[PDB]
């Protein structure tokens, strides 16, 4: 029993965090094989013009108490790749993957190449993440684990005026309409991740919370009209198919659960809580609910 915002064990990622310094800018880097990946703004903009003026020795890379020697450098989109003379002996099995809004991942928050904390979060529909980062956190990474393979999906680049965060995949492509410069940029109006709220309602039923269950069902179109009114993301047939296993485990059809969500949206909770929360939680995917309610290990 119990339901917590759970992150993947961070050890395989901790063994890859290094500190990268260029001039007065210090941030974090990801050391995999003989390459260190970090935000290209460490050289700060005309990034090609700033980069051409740099030599390998201008970049200081520190791994624990050891200095790594930079023997090459190149840029891939908004990521700088520093070729070093030592392959990381702690390099785990890994892949670089680009995630979609609504998908969750673990973040290993670092400062000066040293991991300080780990938390779970989701890529918002507006492509920002509601993280917890201070100055010096740039280069901190987001990831998921599948068996023994780490799938790196996020590298932290900046904080927007509303306190939310923006970054790139490990190939340097931003998530969202953001650029890596100190210009006027704002997060677009956000929406609630509907398939995730439904998954978390199934998790509450599995844990013995059914006060919100009702005898009603709804059509997918009628539910979508109601969802559009409360700034909820549209629910698609793919989302219904993905919720199939949780529907079979609890005996509550997806459209049956959608009618419960409609009633919570139109009437509130009435002083009640679901899984210790007074808000409808949208940062647990259907797969996260199945994993936590099954005990998958790494």
Ligand X SMILES: CNC(=O)CN1C[C@@H](C(=O)Nc2cncc3ccccc23)c2cc(Cl)ccc2C1=O
- Residues near a second copy (CB under 8 A) are 1-12, 14-15, 108-112, 114-121, 130-134, 136-137, 159, 163-165, 207-208, 273, 276-279, 291-298
Instruction: For the segment 110-149, give every residue that binds ligand X (CB under 6 A).
Output: 133-135, 137-138
CB of 126 to a second copy, least distance (A): 15
For residue 66, state whether it binds ligand X (rule: CB under 6 A): no
Could you tell me if 97 and 151 are in contact, meaning their C-beta atoms sit under 8 angstroms apart? yes
Q: Residue 254 to residues 6, 40, 243, 261: CA-CA distances in angstroms?
A: 24, 44, 7, 10
Stretch near Cl ion under the rule CB under 5 A, chosen from 29-37, 91-99, 164-172, 218-226: 91-99
Could you tell me if 20 and 7 are in contact, meaning their C-beta atoms sit under 8 angstroms apart? no
- In a 13 Å sphere around the CA of 168, the CA atoms on its Cβ side amount to 20
Stretch near ligand X under the rule CB under 6 A, chosen from 92-100, 104-112, 157-165, 203-211: 157-165
**From Cl ion, ligand X, a second copy, none, which one binds at residue 111 (CB under 5 to 8 Å depending on kind)?**
a second copy
Tell me the C-alpha distance between 116 and 271, whole Å: 37
Could you tell me if 238 and 228 are in contact, meaning their C-beta atoms sit under 8 angstroms apart? no
- Count CB neighbours of 121 within 10 A: 19
For residue 41, state whether it binds ligand X (rule: CB under 6 A): yes
CB of 178 to a second copy, least distance (A): 16
Could you tell me if 284 and 104 are in contact, meaning their C-beta atoms sit under 8 angstroms apart? yes
For residue 103, state whether it binds Cl ion (rule: CB under 5 A): yes
Which residues share a beta bridge with 159?
165
CB of 6 to a second copy, least distance (A): 4
Eight-state DSSP code of residue 128: -
For residue 255, state whether it binds ligand X (rule: CB under 6 A): no
Helix (H, G, I), strand (E, B) or coil at 73: strand
Of residues 34, 159, 171, 222, which one binds ligand X by CB under 6 A?
Answer: 159
> Smaller CB distance to a second copy: residue 180 or 282?
282
41 belongs to the catalytic site: yes
> Smaller CB distance to Cl ion: residue 103 or 112?
103
> Smaller CB distance to ligand X: residue 133 or 143?
133
Could you tell me if 38 and 82 are in contact, meaning their C-beta atoms sit under 8 angstroms apart? yes
Could you tell me if 34 and 28 are in contact, meaning their C-beta atoms sit under 8 angstroms apart? no
Q: Residue 14 to residues 10, 223, 267: CA-CA distances in angstroms?
A: 6, 43, 45
Helix (H, G, I), strand (E, B) or coil at 14: helix
138 belongs to the catalytic site: yes
| Two structure tokens written together for 101 | 């809004």
Of residues 25, 100, 132, 277, which one binds Cl ion by CB under 5 A?
Answer: 100
Which residues share a beta bridge with 22?
25, 59
> Smaller CB distance to a second copy: residue 68 or 122?
122
Please identify which of the residues 138, 153, 165, 258 carries the catalytic annotation: 138
Cα 161-163-169 angle, rounded to 5 deg: 95
For residue 114, state whether it binds Cl ion (rule: CB under 5 A): no
Please identify which of the residues 41, 73, 156, 165 carries the catalytic annotation: 41
For residue 293, state whether it binds ligand X (rule: CB under 6 A): no
Instruction: Please give the positions annotated as active site.
Output: 41, 138
Site residues (vs Cl ion, CB under 5 A): 99-100, 103
Site residues (vs ligand X, CB under 6 A): 1, 41, 133-135, 137-138, 157-159, 165, 180-182
């Amino acid at each position: 029993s119990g339901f917590r915002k759970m992150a993947f064990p961070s050890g395989k990622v901790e063994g890859c965090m290094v500190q990268v310094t260029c001039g007065t800018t210090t941030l974090n880097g990801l050391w995999l094989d003989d390459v260190v990946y970090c935000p290209r703004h460490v050289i700060c903009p005309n990034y090609e013009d700033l980069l051409i003026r740099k030599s390998n020795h201008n970049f200081l890379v520190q791994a624990g108490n050891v200095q790594l020697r930079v023997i090459g450098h190149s840029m891939q989109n908004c990521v700088l790749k520093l070729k070093v003379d030592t392959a990381n002996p702690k390099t785990p099995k890994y892949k670089f993957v680009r995630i979609q809004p609504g998908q969750t991942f673990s973040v290993l928050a670092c400062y000066n190449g040293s991991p300080s904390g780990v938390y779970q979060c989701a890529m918002r529909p507006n492509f920002t993440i509601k993280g917890s980062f201070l100055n010096g956190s740039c280069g901190s990474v987001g990831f998921n684990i599948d068996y023994d393979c780490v799938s790196f999906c996020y590298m932290h680049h900046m904080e927007l005026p509303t306190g939310v965060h923006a970054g790139t995949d490990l190939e340097g492509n931003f998530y969202g309409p953001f650029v890596d410069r100190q210009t006027a940029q704002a997060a677009g109006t956000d929406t609630t991740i509907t398939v995730n709220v439904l998954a978390w309602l199934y998790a509450a039923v599995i844990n013995g919370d059914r006060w919100f269950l009702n005898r009603f069902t709804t059509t997918l179109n009628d539910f979508n009209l109601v969802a559009m009114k409360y700034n909820y993301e549209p629910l698609t047939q793919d989302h219904v198919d993905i919720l199939g296993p949780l529907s079979a485990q609890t005996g509550i059809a997806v459209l049956d659960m959608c009618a419960s969500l409609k009633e919570l949206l139109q009437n509130g909770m009435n002083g009640r809580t679901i899984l210790g929360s007074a808000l409808l939680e949208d940062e647990f995917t259907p797969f996260d609910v199945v994993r936590q309610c099954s005990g998958v290990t790494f």
